[PDB]
Structure formats: structure tokens, C-alpha cells
């Protein structure tokens, strides 16, 4: 019965997210970031909203989805760059 919908969304938040995603794959400990990764983030937002059980996606639940995906990405990195990347994404992490 539950089918949350992205009726409201944060376009530019995701935009800056994918921007930061860029110029990081240059790191030897960093795997490439592609469009399907962004679609992955979107579907993670959908999964979170379904988990919230509301028929409408919540912006902040989507924010937690962003947080989870970016944290997974950071964990995927080499620990040397991982600290620099976590500081860089800290501007995103606090919003969760």
C-alpha cells in the first residue's frame, strides 16, 4: 500500500553532492562515481521513505539517505584520503 513519492525534492542539494563526488575518483583509493550511483542515491531515498512508511517522501528522510550513501562512499575510500574526504563532506554530514 505504501508508495512514497518524490513530489518534493532538493535538486541542488543532490547537485552539490554529485559535484563533490567528482574530482574524488582521481584518488587511487577512490572508485569512479557515475550516474547510476546517483540513481542509487535516489532509490536509497525511496527505500528510506518506504521505511518511513509515509506515502510521500520526506526531504529529511531523503537527507538521511544521502548521508548513508555518502558514508558508504567514504568508507569505500582509502583511509588516507578518507579523512580528507570526510572533512570535505562534513559540510554535508551534519545535515544528515
Amino acid at each position: 500500500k505504501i508508495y512514497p513519492k518524490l513530489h518534493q525534492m532538493d535538486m541542488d542539494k543532490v547537485s552539490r553532492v554529485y559535484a563533490d563526488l567528482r574530482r574524488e575518483s582521481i584518488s587511487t583509493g577512490s572508485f569512479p562515481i557515475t550516474v547510476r550511483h546517483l540513481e542509487s542515491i535516489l532509490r536509497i531515498a525511496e527505500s528510506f521513505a518506504k521505511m518511513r512508511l509515509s506515502e510521500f517522501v520526506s526531504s529529511y528522510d531523503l537527507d538521511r539517505a544521502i548521508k548513508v550513501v555518502v558514508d558508504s562512499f567514504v568508507d569505500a575510500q582509502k583511509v588516507s584520503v578518507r579523512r580528507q574526504l570526510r572533512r570535505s563532506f562534513a559540510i554535508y554530514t551534519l545535515g544528515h
Binding site: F31, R43, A49, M51, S54
Partner: protein, 193 residues
């Protein structure tokens, strides 16, 4: 469910809810639970489509309950399947055709990924199993459907299944200083998808 939904902190309780018998692993619990919930399927212009299922890639040290995590996952999402990984192959999991001597023609054999379709897909021992089979799985998952044209059978089967791969790090221990791709004995494209 509605009453708990309006209750706040439900998300954290669900995170604690998934595989309670595995102490810790808060992020892992979050990931597997949200995979169980799964994304919303999206389709564009009828033909263009976006999967509503989540492919979880897991790297785990040996003895880290990965198989048991999968076992808790199943029986919770109703429709479920288990992929031994090494046991299945390209033909066995995705789509299989069986020659049927009793009927005297080639017949479809149940692809375990077709069994995965409509439900959650468990995947285990995948980092150790066959690479050509891995490419077959890539192909099948890319379209959320398996297309097979052999032995006179040109059928194509929808494969809507949230999959969760289980993997062991190179030597069983991930090195954080080591790049993930070097910590991974598998292909780059699979981690991308």
C-alpha cells in the same frame, strides 16, 4: 503499522530491528533493512525504466554472520531466494533450459534468479564464485530481466529482486589503507552497478 509510523524514532527502531541477533553493525543493519524496504520502481515513457530493487554489495570477514544475516533477511521479506554463489552458475541462477526426454523437447529450467524475481535475492560466497557467472549476473541485473536465446528458447524473464552479495576481503581482512579495488578481487563494473 500506521500508529508506529507516526511515532518518531521508528527508523532507528527498524535499524535496531533488522538482525537483532547480530550485535553491532548499525550501518550494516541500516543498509540491509532499507534494502528490504527497497526503492520505488520508476518507468519512463513505458519503455525506459528504473529498478525499484536494491543491490547490496557486502564485504565481510569470515565468520561475520553474513550467511546468518542473509538468513534473518529471508523469512522477513516473504518472497525470497538464496544464492550459494559458488553452487549456482550463469545458466543455473539467471536462466536455465533443460532438455526433456519425456516430452522430447527442450524445456525451461527454473532460473534461481527468476525465483529471486518478485522477492528479495540472497547472494553468498559470491566473491569466490565463477567470473563468467558474475558477468551473466551483471547482464541479468542491468535490465532487471534475463534474456535467453538458445536451444530454440528465446524467452526473456523479468527479474525484479533486491539482491545482496556476500564477499570476503582479500585474505579475509580489508586493509583500510589499501584501496577498495585492491581490497576487492572482483571486477570494477560490478561494484559500479
Amino acid at each position: 503499522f500506521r500508529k508506529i509510523s507516526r511515532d518518531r524514532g521508528i527508523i532507528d527502531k527498524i535499524i535496531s530491528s533488522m538482525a537483532p541477533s547480530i550485535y553491532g553493525h548499525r550501518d550494516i543493519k541500516t543498509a540491509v533493512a532499507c534494502s528490504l524496504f527497497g526503492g520505488v520502481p520508476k518507468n519512463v515513457n513505458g519503455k525506459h525504466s528504473i529498478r525499484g530493487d536494491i543491490n547490496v554489495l557486502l564485504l565481510g570477514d569470515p565468520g561475520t554472520a553474513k550467511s546468518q544475516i542473509l538468513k534473518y533477511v529471508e523469512k522477513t521479506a516473504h518472497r525470497a531466494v538464496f544464492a550459494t554463489g559458488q553452487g549456482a552458475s550463469a545458466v543455473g541462477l539467471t536462466a536455465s533450459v533443460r532438455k526433456d526426454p519425456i516430452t522430447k523437447e527442450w524445456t525451461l529450467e527454473g532460473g534461481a534468479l527468476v525465483l529471486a524475481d518478485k522477492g528479495v535475492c540472497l547472494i553468498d560466497e559470491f566473491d569466490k564464485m565463477n567470473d563468467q557467472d558474475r558477468t551473466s549476473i551483471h547482464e541479468a541485473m542491468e535490465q532487471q530481466s534475463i534474456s535467453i536465446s538458445k536451444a530454440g528458447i528465446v524467452t526473456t524473464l523479468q527479474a525484479r529482486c533486491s539482491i545482496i552479495a556476500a564477499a570476503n576481503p582479500n585474505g579475509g581482512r580489508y586493509n583500510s589503507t589499501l584501496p577498495l579495488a585492491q581490497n576487492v578481487s572482483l571486477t570494477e563494473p560490478i561494484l559500479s552497478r
